[PDB]
């Protein structure tokens, strides 16, 4: 069904975005070692 | 006085460490950017499917 | 030494500047993410409507 | 509302640009 | 010594390479920003289409 | 119109990847 697949597509979207936040977190965590 | 040399040598060692970390930071940031791209791409694909539906099952249906 | 000194200080300041830059870049990425997230909400709502009413009302 | 969500989307993307500019401003201080 | 002056030179180059890196990254952020903006415009268009010769037929 | 707009959307996303690769390429020098 189109409804299910679109719902699945939107869940893919949300997972990607959460992954982004994850990497932004890792990026800022690394900058905590930038102390010069 | 020979201390200034010691001071720059240490700052130099600090900067080198700072740099390596920054590299990891940028790489993690690029990954986040890639993730947002994939997410928008997925959304675009979803939007394209909603478009097809509107001009098909909602077009001929009228 | 007097040269490596200036150099070291200079690089230190360059690095401090790049940190702020990346911190700004990270904020931007987060905003685009938020934009795509909210757009996702609008998209599902459009999908719902194409059913909610469009389905039954046709 | 959909228009409401879209304006919020616009606001976010606008904030992204503001930050990109902030990033470029800091970056130019290097060298 | 002839190692510290070098270290700072090596750091100088790395810093230069990172500047270019961040510049390339910012252009990527803008590209995704533009992508999402264009997608939102497409969505708004779809919303209108539905209201137009649709919610009246 | 919408197809055109969607095509543009994807061109932008692809350019995003293009700059990401450039960015990582530049990093290939740091720390060697």
- Which chains have 3+ CB pairs within 8 A of D? C, E
Diameter of chain A by CA atoms? Answer: 57
Dist CA A1 CA A35 (whole Å): 54
Distance of CA C11 to the CA centre of its chain: 27
Of F4, C32, B52, F12, the residue nearest E42 (C-alpha): F4
Find the length of chain C. Answer: 58
Contact E33, D3 (CB under 8 A): no
Diameter of chain D by CA atoms? Answer: 49
Question: Please, is B55 exposed, middle or buried when counting C-beta atoms within 10 Å of its C-beta (0-12, 13-18, 19+)?
Answer: exposed
- Please give the DSSP secondary-structure letter assigned to residue D4: H
With vertex at residue E25, the alpha carbon angle to CA A27 and CA C15, rounded to the nearest 5 degrees, is 60
Q: Would an 8 Å CB–CB cutoff place C49 in contact with chain A?
A: no
Q: Would an 8 Å CB–CB cutoff place A15 in contact with chain C?
A: no
- List C-alpha distances in Å: C12 to B9, B11, B20, C53, E13: 12, 8, 13, 62, 13
Method used to obtain the model: X-ray
Cβ separation C26–B32 shorter than 8 A = yes
- List C-alpha distances in Å: B61 to B52, C12, E45: 13, 67, 21
Resolution (A): 2.2
Q: Which long-range contacts (C-beta less than 8 Å, at least 24 apart) are formed by C48-55?
A: C49/E50, C50/B50, C50/B53, C50/B54, C50/B58, C50/E50, C51/A3, C54/B58, C54/E50
Contact D28, E20 (CB under 8 A): no
B vs F: CB pairs below 8 A: 36
Cβ atoms within 10 Å, residue B6 = 12
- Would you call B3 helix, strand, or coil by DSSP? helix
Q: Take residue B56 and report the two structure tokens written for it.
A: 């098909």
Contact E36, D13 (CB under 8 A): yes
Q: Would an 8 Å CB–CB cutoff place B9 in contact with chain A?
A: no
Domains identified in chain B and CATH numbers? 1-62 (1.20.5.300)
């Amino acid at each position: 069904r189109g409804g299910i697949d679109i719902s699945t597509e939107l869940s893919k979207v949300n997972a990607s975005l959460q992954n982004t936040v994850k990497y932004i977190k890792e990026s800022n965590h690394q900058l905590q070692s930038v102390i010069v | 006085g020979p201390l200034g040399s010691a001071v720059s040598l240490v700052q130099a060692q600090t900067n080198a460490r700072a740099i390596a970390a920054m590299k990891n930071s940028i790489q993690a940031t690029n990954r986040a950017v890639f993730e947002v791209k994939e997410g928008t791409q997925r959304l675009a694909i979803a939007v394209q499917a909603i478009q097809d539906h509107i001009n098909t099952i909602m077009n001929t249906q009228l």
